[model samples]
Target: PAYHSSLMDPDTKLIGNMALLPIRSQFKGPAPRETKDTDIVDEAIYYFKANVFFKNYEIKNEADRTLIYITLYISECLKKLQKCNSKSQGEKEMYTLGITNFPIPGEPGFPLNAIYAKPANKQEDEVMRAYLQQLRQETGLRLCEKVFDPQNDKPSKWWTCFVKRQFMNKSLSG
Candidate 1:
């Protein structure tokens, strides 16, 4: 049974009911509390997003770079999430990794229309599909309930700052 998108409220908050977890430290050791898998996945997503953003900012051609970077980003993020650490004590940070921070904003990282509009170009599309699969594997919180889960068990696959993703989410604005 698919929920009607038109009927669903955009502002509906799934994570609103749960208490925001305290900020934890991003160090080279264990976590303080029992970290959830989803937390780590989200972190990995941030790393991927950051790398993708760097690719976009650095690449000369938008059409040539978008798909490649996005694919790699997804794969790397997923790999990191699979084996994240979760034990030791420290201060938790906010924002973590976010998508908006892909580019410096207003500058335009990758031209969306240029890349997706080229349906005839199967090369990039095929790569994108593969990357999407990897991204899905890393971020396990696909369901709304999963987003609200307080005990997700996935870990990030890379060394990342808890505040990096927040910048992505805020798109470097916050």
Candidate 2:
């Protein structure tokens, strides 16, 4: 099917009690050993150099890049719903998916932690999956969709990426 100029999400589920909130954390115990000196600019560059998760390349557009950060966070939240214990596999994956890089992915989709509320009833999970699917449908921002041509199989389209970022995130980097 051909793409539409003005895209809208198909999933119309009214997400109850879902809100975007900022999270904060501090060191639990003694701070881990530091190998490098504090360098904010270099640290920022290092983050930029790191490969984006769940994708090969990255979207150069600011909006798309921001969306990737958010979507990655949401997807990481989903990973928590898969397990219960802390010492299990989730704890390990959390670091890869988490901001602090905790091993556990996150909380169970049912426990209702922080801003995310796990579906309370049977219809909830369905709604959640549908909404996530809607994200995929409207923006075409799938797990593997990269902004740049890391694969080099197809030439990068800067305009589409820019438009996607502009419409989705609505603001540039902070």
Candidate 3:
């Protein structure tokens, strides 16, 4: 799909009903360097860009965009459950999904963290019902089907891109 440059208005700088949030980061420290052998799988350390995890994209419609974000966030929370490790043995955990002005591509900000939780077993079904009901009331979008369906091809209605900020941790001039 073509860029939704037209969706952005000069007067408001907003893309339709969508608002842009800036991606931010922070440096913790040069910290103590550890000398670990890469040959040792368990002891080896890994390095990642740690940039914004999601690709920047626009849905044109605010309702669809919000639904997609909420669905993806919930999906991620579900994945985390598989590797849950809490000191409180066998305690129930809750996961939550929220909607907001998500960060936009290219722009940068200070590092931020988010938390999610799922309802306990006793209330899991009811919790989901209420959550979906509330979501429907607020966004008028139904999430009966998977938002990130693998069976479908990429929709040609979105403007998506890989957003790597070159100056995030490096000097602009050589």
Candidate 4:
């Protein structure tokens, strides 16, 4: 959370089928912006190992949802990795989790305050979901990059410690 300021998701553009989340500053007029792949990837690396011990991570930023999404996916990835007996198996599961199937935290067991701004209409909701899905896949892959030990072929024990973390003591991710 310290790695980033309040994520200002001021607007969205629907390009073709994918909705793009163009970040803007929370402060009005003439501010910095972050594209999807630019800062979020490295920020995720920062997100990791940064808040390894904190329990009360306030999820209030616009980008807060994105951060939680990354943690949630990484948390789940570790869950699958624990069941694995071999490096190859872990690799397979990691790839699958990042690539194909991953959970989208919404609806049942969803939290009330995880997302700061509510989508006003279905279109906006669609973009929010679209961006959420994009973050899930993109950050999920990068999460695998950060957590997996390169040559050890074993799960990084350091990475698994946060698997049990609850955002605001809520396990909406389970």
**For all candidates, what are the clash counts?**
30, 16, 11, 0
Task: Please report how far candidate 3 places residue 135 from its true position, in Å.
Answer: 5.0
lDDT of each: 0.29, 0.29, 0.25, 0.51
Q: Write the per-residue lDDT of candidate 2 for residues 1-174, one digit (tens) a residue.
A: 211111112331233333211111132211122234531112222232222222343333322322333343333333332332322333334433333321111233322133244556666555544433333222222222333245433323431232222222211121
Report the poorest 10 consecutive residues by lDDT, candidate 4.
23-32
Q: Candidate 1 or 4, higher TM-score?
A: 4
Query: Where's the lowest-lDDT run of ten residues in candidate 3?
Result: 39-48
List runs of model 1 lying over 4 Å from the truth: 1-58, 61-68, 71-111, 115-117, 121-128, 134-158, 162-174
Cα miss at 160, model 2 (Å)? 18
Error of 1 at 63 (Å): 9.6
List, residue by residue over 37-142, the lDDT tens digit for candidate 3: 2211111001111222334334564333323333333332233233334312101222122222223212242111111122335444343434333332222111
lDDT of 2 at 165: 24
- Report the backbone clash tally of model 2: 16
Error of 1 at 146 (Å): 25
Winning candidate number (lDDT): 4
